[PDB]
Write an enzyme that holds these catalytic residues in place. Structure first.
Site, short mmCIF file in Angstrom:
data_model
loop_
_atom_site.label_atom_id
_atom_site.label_comp_id
_atom_site.label_asym_id
_atom_site.label_seq_id
_atom_site.Cartn_x
_atom_site.Cartn_y
_atom_site.Cartn_z
N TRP A 1 2.93 -10.59 4.10
CA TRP A 1 3.06 -9.57 5.15
C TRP A 1 4.56 -9.35 5.32
O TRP A 1 5.38 -10.18 4.89
CB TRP A 1 2.34 -9.97 6.44
CG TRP A 1 2.71 -11.33 6.99
CD1 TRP A 1 3.81 -11.63 7.75
CD2 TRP A 1 1.98 -12.56 6.84
NE1 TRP A 1 3.79 -12.96 8.10
CE2 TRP A 1 2.68 -13.55 7.55
CE3 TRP A 1 0.78 -12.91 6.19
CZ2 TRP A 1 2.24 -14.90 7.62
CZ3 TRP A 1 0.33 -14.22 6.27
CH2 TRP A 1 1.07 -15.20 6.97
N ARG B 1 8.43 -18.98 3.28
CA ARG B 1 7.86 -20.15 2.59
C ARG B 1 7.16 -21.20 3.42
O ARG B 1 6.50 -22.10 2.85
CB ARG B 1 8.93 -20.79 1.69
CG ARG B 1 9.21 -19.94 0.48
CD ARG B 1 10.26 -20.58 -0.42
NE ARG B 1 11.63 -20.32 0.03
CZ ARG B 1 12.66 -21.05 -0.37
NH1 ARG B 1 12.42 -22.11 -1.16
NH2 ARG B 1 13.91 -20.75 0.05
N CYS C 1 13.03 -16.34 -0.65
CA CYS C 1 11.94 -16.09 0.28
C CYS C 1 12.02 -16.86 1.61
O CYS C 1 11.92 -18.08 1.65
CB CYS C 1 10.55 -16.16 -0.41
SG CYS C 1 9.21 -16.07 0.75
N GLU D 1 12.80 -5.67 6.92
CA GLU D 1 12.65 -5.05 5.60
C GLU D 1 12.38 -3.53 5.76
O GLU D 1 12.97 -2.71 5.05
CB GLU D 1 11.46 -5.68 4.87
CG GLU D 1 11.74 -7.17 4.49
CD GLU D 1 10.49 -7.75 3.85
OE1 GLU D 1 10.28 -7.51 2.63
OE2 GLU D 1 9.68 -8.33 4.61
C1 HEM Z 1 3.49 -14.43 4.05
C2 HEM Z 1 4.53 -13.69 4.39
C3 HEM Z 1 5.83 -13.57 3.65
C4 HEM Z 1 6.99 -13.13 4.22
C5 HEM Z 1 7.18 -12.82 5.69
C6 HEM Z 1 7.99 -13.13 3.21
C7 HEM Z 1 9.33 -12.77 3.46
C8 HEM Z 1 10.18 -12.43 2.42
C9 HEM Z 1 11.34 -11.64 2.56
C10 HEM Z 1 11.85 -11.01 3.83
C11 HEM Z 1 11.92 -11.54 1.36
C12 HEM Z 1 13.17 -10.72 1.06
C13 HEM Z 1 12.62 -9.41 0.49
C14 HEM Z 1 13.66 -8.31 0.30
O1 HEM Z 1 14.71 -8.29 0.97
O2 HEM Z 1 13.48 -7.43 -0.57
C15 HEM Z 1 11.12 -12.27 0.45
C16 HEM Z 1 11.45 -12.41 -0.88
C17 HEM Z 1 10.52 -13.05 -1.70
N1 HEM Z 1 9.33 -13.65 -1.39
FE1 HEM Z 1 8.47 -13.67 0.26
N2 HEM Z 1 7.49 -13.61 2.06
C18 HEM Z 1 6.15 -13.79 2.23
C19 HEM Z 1 5.20 -14.19 1.28
C20 HEM Z 1 5.50 -14.38 -0.07
C21 HEM Z 1 4.54 -14.65 -1.06
C22 HEM Z 1 3.05 -14.77 -0.88
C23 HEM Z 1 5.24 -14.81 -2.24
C24 HEM Z 1 4.70 -15.10 -3.57
C25 HEM Z 1 3.52 -15.71 -3.70
C26 HEM Z 1 6.61 -14.60 -1.94
C27 HEM Z 1 7.62 -14.67 -2.87
C28 HEM Z 1 8.82 -14.02 -2.60
C29 HEM Z 1 9.75 -13.77 -3.68
C30 HEM Z 1 9.58 -14.13 -5.17
C31 HEM Z 1 10.80 -13.17 -3.12
C32 HEM Z 1 12.04 -12.68 -3.85
C33 HEM Z 1 11.80 -11.29 -4.47
C34 HEM Z 1 13.01 -10.64 -5.10
O3 HEM Z 1 13.95 -11.31 -5.57
O4 HEM Z 1 13.11 -9.40 -5.17
N3 HEM Z 1 6.75 -14.39 -0.62
N4 HEM Z 1 10.09 -12.89 1.12
C1 LIG Z 2 5.65 -11.05 -0.94
C2 LIG Z 2 6.70 -10.32 -0.15
C3 LIG Z 2 6.60 -10.38 1.23
C4 LIG Z 2 7.54 -9.65 1.99
N1 LIG Z 2 7.55 -9.69 3.34
N2 LIG Z 2 8.51 -8.96 1.38
C5 LIG Z 2 8.61 -8.84 0.05
C6 LIG Z 2 9.77 -7.98 -0.41
O1 LIG Z 2 9.66 -7.37 -1.67
C7 LIG Z 2 10.78 -6.54 -1.95
C8 LIG Z 2 11.43 -6.98 -3.26
N3 LIG Z 2 11.91 -8.33 -3.07
C9 LIG Z 2 12.62 -6.10 -3.65
C10 LIG Z 2 12.22 -4.63 -3.78
O2 LIG Z 2 13.22 -6.58 -4.86
C11 LIG Z 2 13.00 -5.80 -6.04
C12 LIG Z 2 14.24 -5.84 -6.89
C13 LIG Z 2 14.62 -4.76 -7.72
C14 LIG Z 2 15.78 -4.85 -8.49
C15 LIG Z 2 16.23 -3.72 -9.39
C16 LIG Z 2 16.54 -6.01 -8.41
C17 LIG Z 2 16.13 -7.05 -7.57
N4 LIG Z 2 16.85 -8.19 -7.48
N5 LIG Z 2 15.00 -6.95 -6.84
C18 LIG Z 2 7.70 -9.53 -0.77
#
Ligand code: HEM
Ligand SMILES: Cc1cc(N)nc(COC[C@H](N)[C@H](C)OCc2cc(C)cc(N)n2)c1
Ligand code: HEM
Ligand SMILES: Cc1cc(N)nc(COC[C@H](N)[C@H](C)OCc2cc(C)cc(N)n2)c1
Ligand SMILES: C[C@H](O)[C@H](O)[C@H]1CNc2nc(N)[nH]c(=O)c2N1
Ligand SMILES: C[C@H](O)[C@H](O)[C@H]1CNc2nc(N)[nH]c(=O)c2N1
Ligand SMILES: [Zn+2]
Lengths: 405, 404
Positions: B280, B111, B108, B285
């Site tokens: 947000w 953070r 993320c 993305e």
């Molecule tokens: C407030 C604005 C936030 C922004 C701009 C943001 C940004 C991002 C971005 C760009 C990613 C990559 C997502 C992707 O490529 O699919 C991400 C992953 C993640 N963020 Fe955030 N984030 C935010 C808030 C949060 C919050 C509130 C949480 C949890 C409480 C969180 C937990 C995560 C987690 C767990 C991932 C990894 C998800 C995965 O492996 O699929 N983030 N974040």
């Molecule tokens: C909280 C939050 C904020 C923000 N700006 N963006 C996000 C992005 O959520 C997208 C998810 N990380 C994506 C779809 O991961 C889902 C996924 C699916 C599968 C099959 C594998 C994998 N590693 N991850 C989440």
């Protein structure tokens, strides 16, 4: 399924298993507890013999004679030679195979589809810095081939027990000087400030432009290095222009044609070749994105954005992205017009995907460093972004080695 | 040896010591690095030790380690585990653990915000119907008419006896993916499987490119139930371009709320199989991945033709030029509709600041370089030049199997 790393392509949904990684004889920096994949540089006797045997085994496999009598006799020659001398020496065809395998093995190289096509100049007879210079000029001449670039490596004598090393002090055969200013800024390439100041300490009379070609600092065993100026007509350069932005030419930007790495160590069968410069042709993003736009390099993004009349006061205009695209386009266009070989990052990554497939069938895997393989602009627009990759060290290998000073 | 981490742009070095606190292996070994892999290929003393570690983390954060309070709470947890094989978090502990799980997420980039998280305790949920109400209140709160606010809603934990509470959808908001018998997909090809589950469970499908899916919600050991989100609840942003008039004619759009709903929240050994969370978006993305990935909406070529670019050759950089304009359309339209978004330059800058705060506060910060560096213009952002150490700390968000 299988007891080997499972490797997924997320765009195509296809799966492979890397079995080649089992051949890795050398540990990288990662452990179960932490991944260090992103670090740029993470931190003999019987030892020689076992690397030598492994290499000789690789050689005999590649010519399909494993277990043969020629194979067992070569093994015996090698131990005999190590037994009497502490070291041994490669047959010419062993060097050629090893240098190609080192390139094939390089996890950071996206241009490996080309690996089978490498001219190996054997310079293991070199005995002076003057002679290194002739060899190097010949390499540059062959490699440049008036713009129709050909991959090449020139191999100088191996490290020898208690004799000084052959070294090329410069990190590439072609580098632009970086002159430290009184205001603390740098004129030319900041990457080269140290080698520039070493050239001066060694008697080079410095220029003062943005694109002054450095002389070579060449060290023959147990001598101070000697300075050699490349004849200007041997260093092919490309003045940079943009296909529609007419003012771009007025920036007086340029880059040289030949990317030739000169400070890496080639290790084959435990033998260490400390001077072994190799060259290919550029992928356009190395020039147009890293060398010209890194903030710690020529850093020209803002100047180009100002010429394009972009809003540089706010990130959300994407002024940096738009300028980088045009700079990259100018690089491609100018090389194309000049008829100098160059590959764009799309065509390069597509060919690397084909390489991954070729190697899956040939060897059951390909060591690859995702962070270096994915280009520095437009990453997810290229097929490599979506491709998982397993990174490990195989030998023969190109290795980083400490600067000679 | 703790790892030395270098910034290549600035030449500054730090040492990560936080990684010593990691108690769970990732995919890498000394023989090979599997850092680029998206998914992990892979009694009571166990639970009790993670529980104590989490309780200690908690009292330490409120500056009260060693207090009668700290001591009696460890006794409670120990007494509850010894008798029942499990225990329950206090609401303040849940709140702390949810924020830490986010702080610890290596993938993320947002953070910097980790301390500002609204936590809804939904652990008194006993039916899918109640899950829907809580989910609605979350969307309403997090959306906030476009002034988006990070939130999480935590449903009841996993329990040894029974099935899990689960949201089958991967996000609270998703567009249908309708497979045409002739190979193709209409809508979001990432959502074909969940779209078909919805239909199979009795959803009347539409036929658009941007049909919002209903939610499939599962209470323990029951078939999932279907719930249509009230249209006024799902905020959407029509996509137009500041200078290219025909761009709006594309009919493109994207929802305001990114809300992940299929990940497992792990705190003190306890597992929360349904704990949707939202923030947000970062513009890339939507602009780069969701619209431009070849296996997503894949609109690069259509935009490139509308822009009149030479599409015949990679070396015109038509892909790069269209991608940029697409990302710009996203930023512009979100800003015009007054909906929170962040561009990848501002986001990565804020992440660098986060790395520095975390170094001071904890001695390191787990980060997965491949996911932190954005999918366009990587080396144009400061994070590209930043070495990063990736490892698993707990509390943690984790992947879990699909429930079907
Ligand atoms: C407030 C604005 C936030 C922004 C701009 C943001 C940004 C991002 C971005 C760009 C990613 C990559 C997502 C992707 O490529 O699919 C991400 C992953 C993640 N963020 Fe955030 N984030 C935010 C808030 C949060 C919050 C509130 C949480 C949890 C409480 C969180 C937990 C995560 C987690 C767990 C991932 C990894 C998800 C995965 O492996 O699929 N983030 N974040
Ligand atoms: C909280 C939050 C904020 C923000 N700006 N963006 C996000 C992005 O959520 C997208 C998810 N990380 C994506 C779809 O991961 C889902 C996924 C699916 C599968 C099959 C594998 C994998 N590693 N991850 C989440
Ligand atoms: C044929 C054309 C070639 C292309 C387009 C090419 C492409 C590249 C690129 C883009 C990089 C990353 C460079 C960076 O970011 O600094 C790279 C790294 C590398 N390539 Fe190549 N390559 C080519 C030929 C060669 C040859 C001929 C060799 C050696 C025989 C080689 C060995 C390497 C090595 C060892 C690295 C890693 C350099 C390092 O760690 O600093 N490549 N290649
Ligand atoms: C042969 C070849 C072809 C091609 N297109 N590109 C190249 C790229 O060479 C650039 C090198 N990777 C870099 C700059 O090596 C120098 C270097 C110095 C230091 C101190 C660290 C490090 N990792 N690398 C090499
Ligand atoms: C921190 C990070 O490892 C470093 O900046 C890397 C990232 N990827 C790279 N990739 C290539 N091809 N060349 C580089 O110099 C780098 N730099
Ligand atoms: C194989 C590779 O790891 C995969 O494509 C990753 C790369 N980086 C990513 N980065 C982010 N932020 N999100 C992603 O889905 C991915 N996908
Ligand atoms: Zn690793």
């Amino acid at each position: 399924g299988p007891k080997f790393p499972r490797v997924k392509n997320w765009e195509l949904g296809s799966i492979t298993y890397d079995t080649l990684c089992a051949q890795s004889q050398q540990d990288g920096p990662c452990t179960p507890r932490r991944c260090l994949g992103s670090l740029v540089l993470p931190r003999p006797a019987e030892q020689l013999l076992s690397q030598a045997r492994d290499f000789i085994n690789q050689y005999y496999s590649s010519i399909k004679r494993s277990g043969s009598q020629a194979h067992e006799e070569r093994l015996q020659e090698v131990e005999a030679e190590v037994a009497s001398t502490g070291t041994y020496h490669l047959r010419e065809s062993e060097l050629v195979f090893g240098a190609k395998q080192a390139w094939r093995n390089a996890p950071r190289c996206v241009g490996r589809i080309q690996w089978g096509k490498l001219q190996v100049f054997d310079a293991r007879d070199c005995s002076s810095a003057q002679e290194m210079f002739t060899y190097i000029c010949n390499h540059i001449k062959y490699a440049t081939n008036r713009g129709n670039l050909r991959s090449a490596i020139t191999v100088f004598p191996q490290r020898a027990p208690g004799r000084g090393d052959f070294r090329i002090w410069n990190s590439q055969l072609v580098r632009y000087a970086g002159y430290r200013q009184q205001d603390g800024s740098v004129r030319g390439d900041p990457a080269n400030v140290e080698i520039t100041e070493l050239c001066i300490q060694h008697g080079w009379t410095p220029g003062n432009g943005r694109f002054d070609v450095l002389p070579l600092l060449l060290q023959a065993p147990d001598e101070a290095p000697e300075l050699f100026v490349l004849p200007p007509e041997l260093v092919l350069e490309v003045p940079l222009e943009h296909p529609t932005l007419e003012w771009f030419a007025a920036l007086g930007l340029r880059w040289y044609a030949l990317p030739a790495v000169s400070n890496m160590l080639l290790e084959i069968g435990g033998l260490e070749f400390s001077a072994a410069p190799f060259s290919g042709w550029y992928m356009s993003t190395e020039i147009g994105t890293r060398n010209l736009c890194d903030p710690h390099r020529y850093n020209i993004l803002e100047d180009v954005a100002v010429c394009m009349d972009l809003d540089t006061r706010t990130t959300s205009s994407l002024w940096k992205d738009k300028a980088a695209v045009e700079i990259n386009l100018a690089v491609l266009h100018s090389f194309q017009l000049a008829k100098v070989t160059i590959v764009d990052h799309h065509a390069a990554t597509v060919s690397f995907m084909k390489h991954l497939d070729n190697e899956q069938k040939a060897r059951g895997g390909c060591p690859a460093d995702w962070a270096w393989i994915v280009p520095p602009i437009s990453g997810s627009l290229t097929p490599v972004f979506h491709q998982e990759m397993v990174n490990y060290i195989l030998s023969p290998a190109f290795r980083y080695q400490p600067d000679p000073w």
